[PDB]
Amino acid sequence: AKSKNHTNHNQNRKAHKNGIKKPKKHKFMSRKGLDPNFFRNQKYCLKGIQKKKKELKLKAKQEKNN
């Protein structure tokens, strides 16, 4: 027999029953496919920063532990 083809009835009620969920909005987004030659350089920056910081901390630890 003929079928009710379509209706949006009650769909808004269903949607609002569990609220209109919002995205979680995390602090950090993955940089997988964004601006290469920039995020690679950022990787180099961060590597150098860790190298210098860790070597300073290691120098302090060695001079404090004798």
Binding site: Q11, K14, A15, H16, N18, I20, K21, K22, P23, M29, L34, D35
Partner: protein, 155 residues
Amino acid sequence: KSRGKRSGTRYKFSKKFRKHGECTANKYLEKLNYGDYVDIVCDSTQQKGMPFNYYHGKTGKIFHITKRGVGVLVNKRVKHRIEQKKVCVRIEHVRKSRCNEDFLLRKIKNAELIKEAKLKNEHINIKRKTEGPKPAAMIKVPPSKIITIEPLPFY
């Protein structure tokens, strides 16, 4: 039966009266930075990098910048939830959003007010005023200015 990319955009993607023609040269000088809000208005004169029908007139913050394009993160309502959508458009189809300008001006002005208030050791209300009921007023008006109003007859 028809759901093409540009279906139903007869008027939305049409140029305004006497405002046809390519984008102005000065628009290419617009300065864009990561994380700032941007409006998505489709410029029909530029076909490549055109946003989808839905996002025309929406706002979102930039999450990616390329040589001639911007990836902007836009909220889209899908049935029972909002979800984040990364739309990639060209420069002509994006413009700096004024959705923040009142907030930025408020920040600057309130900072330069708070500095002086703390300098003078005063307590001030920095929040916006949401002005409501007006105070009593003691107003004067010439007698030749009061005019008598009565409903008019039919004609």
